[PDB]
Ligand binder design. Structure first.
Ligand code: PXP
Length: 228
């Protein structure tokens, strides 16, 4: 693999997908999903221009984070995008800049209470289980309003929007409709809540549908770093 080459290609596809549907490419944030890839591979991405990285497992994330802190690398943004058990919340709160997987209030409160006061608030997204009946992550859409309100008062967090890991679909129509469900909910949150600007939605194979539907952040793993 040439990570630098993949980055530019993915970025071209992102830019193509945004322009094709009348969006500025500036609206879509590329989040490089570096789970199960060595810090050397992240380094190749960092050198090529990538600054935003997503990790699914806490210790693996912190190692990579501590590592690039020691090298002195600036302007990085680390998103934790895997499920978050209670006993591993302290590590996420101390080292990450974003968490995409808030799906119950006890975990949000722990993250709030373990977040060092010198750090800016942890940017958090509420995860919706929009279409996956084999998953236990994410709330139902009916729960969004209540959970968003509870989480919105936590002063060491900053509620920024919604995330969803849709059940896998092959039909492009279903990818788009499911993503549109999320964008509608995102839209509705934004009419009421301050600084709702992030809809984390779309991976390597449903990128186009997700961007057409209104996603602001795609989470690309395979098309950048190869397979896992
Ligand atoms: C939460 C999350 N986002 C993004 C990805 C990236 O998927 P892909 O490799 O197809 O780009 C993954 C892979 O597990 C993921 O779990």
């Amino acid at each position: 693999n040439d990570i630098a080459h993949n980055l530019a290609q993915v970025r071209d596809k992102i830019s193509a997908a945004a322009t094709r549907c009348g969006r500025s490419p500036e609206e879509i944030t590329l989040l490089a999903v570096s789970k199960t890839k060595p810090a050397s591979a992240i380094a190749e991405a960092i050198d090529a221009g990538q600054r935003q990285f997503g990790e699914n497992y806490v210790q693996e994330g912190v190692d990579k984070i501590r590592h690039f802190q020691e090298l002195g690398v600036t302007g990085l943004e680390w998103h934790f995008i895997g499920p978050l058990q209670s006993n591993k919340s302290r590590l996420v709160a101390e080292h990450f800049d974003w968490c995409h997987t808030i799906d119950r209030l006890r975990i949000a409160t722990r993250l709030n209470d373990q977040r060092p006061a010198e750090l800016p608030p942890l940017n958090v997204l509420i995860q919706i289980n929009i279409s996956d009946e084999n998953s236990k992550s994410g709330i139902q859409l009916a729960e969004l309003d209540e959970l968003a309100a509870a989480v919105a008062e936590l002063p060491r967090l900053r509620l920024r929007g919604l995330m969803a890991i849709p059940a896998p679909e092959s039909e492009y129509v279903r990818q788009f409709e499911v993503a549109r469900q999320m964008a509608v909910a995102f839209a509705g949150l934004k009419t009421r809540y301050p600084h709702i600007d992030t809809l984390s939605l779309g991976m390597s194979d449903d990128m186009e549908a997700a961007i057409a539907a209104g996603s602001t952040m795609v989470r690309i793993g395979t098309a950048i770093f190869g397979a896992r």
